[PDB]
Amino acid sequence: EEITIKHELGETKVKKKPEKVVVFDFGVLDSLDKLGVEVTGVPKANLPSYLEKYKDSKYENVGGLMEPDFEKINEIAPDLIIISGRQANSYEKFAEIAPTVYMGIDTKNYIDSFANNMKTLGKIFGKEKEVEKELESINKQIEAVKAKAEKTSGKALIVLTTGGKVSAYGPGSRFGIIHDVLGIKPVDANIEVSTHGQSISFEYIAEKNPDYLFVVDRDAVVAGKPSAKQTIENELVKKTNAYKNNRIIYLNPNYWYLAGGGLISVAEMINEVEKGIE
Ligand SMILES: O=C(NCCCCCNC(=O)c1cccc(O)c1O)c1cccc(O)c1O
Ligand SMILES: [Fe+3]
Ligand code: NI
Ligand code: NI
Ligand code: NI
Ligand code: NI
């Protein structure tokens, strides 16, 4: 029983319950994990800590997030390839091999895109109720943090560290869920939305003077070398409220940077926010 999927990059006809599934989005991979859905191929080179089981030799290595092994993908001859924003530009290449669905998060409507992505997996795999149950759990999660949020005021800044440099995310960004969904107040509400974040210096941080400084150590997951500490915790940063209040919250980059938009990653993401402000 074939079905047709509409997505940002077009329309794909897909066999229901495809036998061989290749996944280039870790959110999706953690969602299929979460659902008991079996995958064939993953890019093992960038696997998140929490998805380390997909290193097993039962799974085919199809390369890296930025470096798909196209020849290997061909030899697998998958029934479905699922990609996201990091591979958007290779859509045609993938679609040439096998039916390819694109599943990205619209950051203007994080939760709505998330839900539709998940519901599309529900459809493809016959997992509609399991999906709805998980969507419901995250909804209650949100409301709770949404209450805890409104309890207090105090403004938040979201930063990312890569090689001693630091860049910022605000509403509508890849990390906007903090502001947009969970109801934390942004220290700067008009931050130019950018996939690796608006470049800034410490001069900027110790100015907007946030109560909460959410940090994402990019180097921990792209270099394998955590830098987040030393980049951040320096004189000019330490002057802030957040360092004095011990509210510099290092967010887990395995979830936040390599893998969001999945049943597991979004639940975990929300929990790191909750704990961050309790
Ligand atoms: O278009 C993208 N990157 C192209 C430029 C990347 C230049 C090199 N990057 C890395 O080495 C790297 C490796 C693994 C995961 C990443 O996100 C990385 O950026 C991109 C899109 C959505 C999210 C991202 O994050 C991206 O990057
Ligand atoms: Fe990146
Ligand atoms: Ni299941
Ligand atoms: Ni190869
Ligand atoms: Ni081969
Ligand atoms: Ni329902």
Distance 101 CA to ligand 5 centre (A): 23
Distance 129 CA to ligand 6 centre (A): 8
Return the closest-CA partner of residue 166 out of 193, 203, 209: 203
Which atom of ligand 1 is found nearest the CA of 65? 14
Distance 236 CA to ligand 3 centre (A): 49
Which atom of ligand 1 is found nearest the CA of 86? 21
Residue nearest to atom 23 of ligand 1 (CA): 86
**Burial (CB count within 10 angstroms: exposed 0-12, middle 13-18, buried 19+), residue 129:** exposed
DSSP for 106-146? -GGGHHHHHHHHHHHHHHHHT-HHHHHHHHHHHHHHHHHHH
Residue nearest to atom 12 of ligand 1 (CA): 222
SS3 category, 80: strand
Resolution of this entry, Å: 2.1
**Burial (CB count within 10 angstroms: exposed 0-12, middle 13-18, buried 19+), residue 225:** exposed
Which atom of ligand 1 is found nearest the CA of 46? 14
Handedness of CA 100, 21, 127, 146 (dihedral sign): negative
Contact 29, 264 (CB under 8 A): no
Which atom of ligand 1 is found nearest the CA of 196? 25
Specify the DSSP element, H or E, that contains 81. strand 80-83
Which of 86, 91, 194, 257 should be mutated for ligand 1, with most atoms under 8 A from CB?
Answer: 86
Distance CA 210, CA 203 (A): 13
Distance 19 CA to ligand 6 centre (A): 28
Which of 66, 103, 257 should be mutated for ligand 1, with most atoms under 8 A from CB?
Answer: 66
Residues with CB under 5 A from ligand 5 (ion): 75
Contact 213, 157 (CB under 8 A): yes
> Any idea which ligand is nearest the CA of 135?
6
SS3 content of the chain, % helix, strand, coil (to 5): 45, 20, 35
Instruction: Note the helical H segments in the chain.
Output: 26-35, 70-76, 91-97, 110-125, 128-151, 177-180, 202-208, 219-222, 228-232, 235-238, 241-244, 253-256, 263-277
What residues are in contact with ligand 1 under a 6 Å CB criterion? 46, 65-66, 85-86, 195, 222
Return the closest-CA partner of residue 99 out of 115, 114, 120, 116: 120
Q: If you compute the radius of gyration of the chain from its CA atoms, what whole number of angstroms results?
A: 19
Question: How many other CB atoms are there within 10 angstroms of residue 99's CB atom?
Answer: 19
Distance CA 68, CA 61 (A): 9
Helix and strand numbers, DSSP H then E, in the chain: 13, 13
Residue nearest to atom 22 of ligand 1 (CA): 86
Helix axis angle for 26-35 and 128-151, nearest 10°, is 120
Which atom of ligand 1 is found nearest the CA of 64? 14
Distance CA 58, CA 268 (A): 26
Distance 33 CA to ligand 3 centre (A): 9
Return the closest-CA partner of residue 206 out of 170, 179, 235: 235
Structure tokens at 58: 């039962």
Distance CA 8, CA 101 (A): 9
CATH 3.40.50.1980 corresponds to the domain 2-131: yes
Distance CA 189, CA 158 (A): 11
